Chains A and B, each alone.
With several copies, the nearest count.
Chain A
């Protein structure tokens, strides 16, 4: 609901591409052109290098159908285990499997260090001011014990 829709006159007009199984990876690579172009349309307007990609399962397979998505055993380290693989362009491809689209998003996450952190959808949880057990839990549970039936109720 943020990412600026990428529309080219030839094909993607109407807002998105239509891929058909006819003839070869020629359909599956024809999406890998649109990922590559979206990455260069970040580097024009954003100027950041567009360090990830997100795609629904069915639309990340046809981007895997292109070839040029190489997971492979030795390459595990850089993809942080969440990525479905690396596009040959050097981008991790994060399979979605959730949203109701079949979309392919490109985006950026770059922290140059110190206080400069820039990338889509900044998230940024807030626990500071709360007493937590371990820092990473992002908000604390609470228990109640309803005083009608005494059986507890736990919520975060």
Chain B
């Protein structure tokens, strides 16, 4: 939910693509979380060692 007045600002001042930056942080966030999930089902589901 990025503003339509943002992209024009951010295309002009920073040259960055606005949209393609959010699609950058959403696509990365889900694949970071889905990846933080399985590592957290390994450490959740792992027996206690040295016992």
Contacts and interface: CB of A to CB of B under 8 A. Distances in A.
B12 A129 contact: yes
Interface residues of B, number: 8
A129 B4 contact: no
Contacts, number: 15
B20 to A, nearest CB: 14
What is the predominant secondary structure among interface residues of chain A facing chain B?
Answer: loop
B12 A142 contact: no
A130 interface: yes
B9 interface: yes
Interface in A77-133: 126-130
Interface in B1-37: 4, 7-13
Interface of A: 126-130, 142
6 contacts: A128-B12, A129-B8, A129-B9, A129-B12, A130-B8, A130-B12
